[PDB]
Ligand binder design. Structure first.
Ligand SMILES: [K+]
Ligand SMILES: [Mg+2]
Ligand SMILES: [Mg+2]
Ligand SMILES: [Mg+2]
Ligand SMILES: [Mg+2]
Ligand SMILES: [Mg+2]
Ligand SMILES: [Mg+2]
Ligand SMILES: [Mg+2]
Lengths: 119, 171, 123, 55
RNA sequence: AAAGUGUACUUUAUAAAGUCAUUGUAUUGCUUACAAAUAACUAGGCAGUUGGGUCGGCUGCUAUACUAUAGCGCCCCAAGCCUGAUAAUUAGCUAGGCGUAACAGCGGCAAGCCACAGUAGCACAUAAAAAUUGCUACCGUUAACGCAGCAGUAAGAAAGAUUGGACAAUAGCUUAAGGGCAGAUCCAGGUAAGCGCUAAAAUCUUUGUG
């Protein structure tokens, strides 16, 4: 489920996060678990293209923000897609709308119906 | 290798583009499928179609028209697992979660008699739709009761039904 | 015989190095300007600039000699001292001391006996 | 090689702080030595020019 | 250049930096002369051989010097070039070193240069490079191997050491997360160059006892 992309997981590349999101996660905010939560480090996705052969990997383009400021002049592809630890950071408006849905997902995981490790 | 700059992406796409149009293949596949294995192939076809559209530049729900046909084939075949997987990863397959689709899947599972599967579909659907219809909930409850009566002899089935009933009541 | 080199290397670096000229467990060193990739005691040099006696004497000090004028000349040309030569120059006040990186490895518990089997025979 | 950790604990903070100090110290050391070499380089060049004129 | 540059890569609630790619005023040099063992029971040697002219002699991207190593190669032209030449025997050279009042004579140690890696012909490799890189033929053992790397074994010879420990120090390779690798090297074992000391006790050394 797309709600499972909020919590970082081991061996979870950005490609899995991007693919399992509405509209391929265009215009979303993503960051790795090794980055400090208060450092304001994240990627903003502007364009996504799937792999020619595999069709399970994605080349993403966007902007890189450090301390809420751009680090480069023009959009560039994400060179660290293949690394692990990526997770989804919904915007405040999305967080408010997804409040009840997150509670439902957490309850299902707690009861054991949904296994986040498998997904 | 993909270009570093976004301004050079258009040239990269135009060179040796992969096959993108799979509507004809999917339509033929849906009709020809009569077993669970064919249903799995259709799911792979949906995934490839949803991923392939990005090369043209579309980011919409490509697999929005054949969802109903796939449900009908699954109900006739009698396997509900493909539908359970689809709802679990609805976005990944390019299917937009909607109430009419949830009702159709629940009715198909209820007709098959798998109340436990009906509860699973409803529970997964509740993670995409904020408000679940009360009439649909009653239908699933009836399906669970029918499932329990049909498979009352299996203790494991009874435990699964009880667990799903608690989940529906809690959520 | 041992004419000093005049042409500078074209594909390697010049360094200021310590040359072992001691006896059995009685080290003594000479500082010279030599090509980076050579034998330790090779006869190819540009100049000999100093000497060092690392062991203490009756006065409790170590003794070090160096050409002050020529050290500056070779440092200007591009000669790169080794780690130990930096320590000698830093303490002698020719150039500022070079900071060292932090260390985490548990230090060796047998440094003066691990490589001397004669002591281990008695141990 | 670089050190990264998903756990925001004291160990991670210590490694970052120590690395910053070492890099800052080394950068300052490099500037001082180069300035001395440049100053000495000018002095020897001037001496050679004087010697050439005398010859 | 112990440098600059980057729509590049990595680390940061702590940041300075490094990594990768690329850049030099002509963009990595040729030639000549002198010295160095025997040797005439080696007297003739050379025909691309000596010289001249056209052409070729590549890996670009300041301007001139009327083309600015070369029989180095093709074609053409003129007959010249060497003559203790040509052919043989022996040896790595310099030098430390040993004898001698010196002159001379001979060639164990530290280091510099050159050549080679079973034999020969080639490809890379230009500028600092082929023991531990390839292709082919051949020789010796058994499609493979060649210890003139350290230790070690067999035969030969009057006569040639352990199948040892350690990267702690010096030098080197890699790496900004402070590490990894190493028969160079440092130590030990073995062998009557050489140098030093011990092989007997003494108020339990009056540098004592207290
Ligand atoms: K040869
Ligand atoms: Mg010989
Ligand atoms: Mg050969
Ligand atoms: Mg070599
Ligand atoms: Mg041999
Ligand atoms: Mg040997
Ligand atoms: Mg070192
Ligand atoms: Mg004897």
């Amino acid at each position: 489920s797309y709600l499972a992309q909020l919590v970082p997981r081991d061996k979870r590349t950005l490609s899995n996060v991007i693919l399992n999101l509405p509209n391929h996660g265009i215009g979303g905010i993503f960051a790795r678990d090794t980055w400090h939560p208060e450092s304001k480090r994240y990627w903003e996705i502007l364009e996504v293209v799937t792999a020619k052969d595999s069709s399970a990997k994605v080349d993403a383009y966007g902007y890189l923000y450090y301390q809420g400021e751009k680090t480069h002049p023009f959009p560039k592809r994400v060179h660290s897609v293949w690394r692990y630890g990526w997770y989804w950071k919904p915007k405040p408006e999305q967080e408010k709308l997804l409040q009840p849905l997150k509670e439902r997902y957490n309850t299902l995981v707690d009861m054991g119906i949904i296994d986040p490790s498998q997904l | 290798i993909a270009p570093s700059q976004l301004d050079k992406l258009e040239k990269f796409v135009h060179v040796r583009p992969p096959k993108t149009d799979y509507e004809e293949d999917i339509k033929q596949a849906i009709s020809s499928v009569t077993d669970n294995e064919g249903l799995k192939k259709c799911l792979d076809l949906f995934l490839t179609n949803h991923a392939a559209q990005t090369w043209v530049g579309k980011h919409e729900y490509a697999n929005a028209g054949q969802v109903s046909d796939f449900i009908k084939v699954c109900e006739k075949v009698g396997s509900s697992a493909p539908l359970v997987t689809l709802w679990q990863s609805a976005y990944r397959y390019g299917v937009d979660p909607t109430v009419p689709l949830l009702r159709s899947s629940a009715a198909a599972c209820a007709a098959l008699g798998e109340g436990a599967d009906a509860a699973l579909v409803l529970l997964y659907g509740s993670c995409y739709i904020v408000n679940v219809p009360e009439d649909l909930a009653a239908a699933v409850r009836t399906a669970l009761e029918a499932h329990e009566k049909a498979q009352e002899g299996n203790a494991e089935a009874l435990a699964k039904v009880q667990k799903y009933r608690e989940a529906l009541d809690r959520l | 015989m041992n004419n000093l080199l005049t042409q500078l290397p074209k594909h390697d670096l010049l360094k200021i190095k310590l040359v072992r000229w001691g006896f059995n467990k009685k080290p003594f060193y000479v500082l010279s300007v030599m090509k980076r990739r050579q034998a330790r005691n090779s006869g190819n040099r540009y100049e000999d600039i100093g000497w060092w006696d690392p062991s203490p004497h009756q006065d409790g000090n170590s003794h070090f000699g160096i050409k002050f004028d020529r050290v500056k000349y070779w440092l200007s040309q591009g000669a790169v001292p080794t780690e130990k030569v930096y320590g000698l120059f830093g303490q002698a006040g020719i150039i500022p001391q070079k900071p060292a990186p932090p260390k985490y490895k548990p230090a060796d518990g047998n440094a003066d006996t691990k490589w001397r089997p004669e002591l281990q025979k008695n141990l | 090689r670089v050190f990264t950790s998903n756990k925001m604990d004291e160990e991670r903070a210590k490694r970052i702080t120590e690395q910053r100090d070492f890099i800052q110290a080394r950068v300052e050391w490099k500037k001082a030595t180069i300035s001395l070499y440049k100053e000495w380089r000018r002095t020897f060049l001037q001496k050679d020019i004087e010697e050439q004129h005398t010859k």
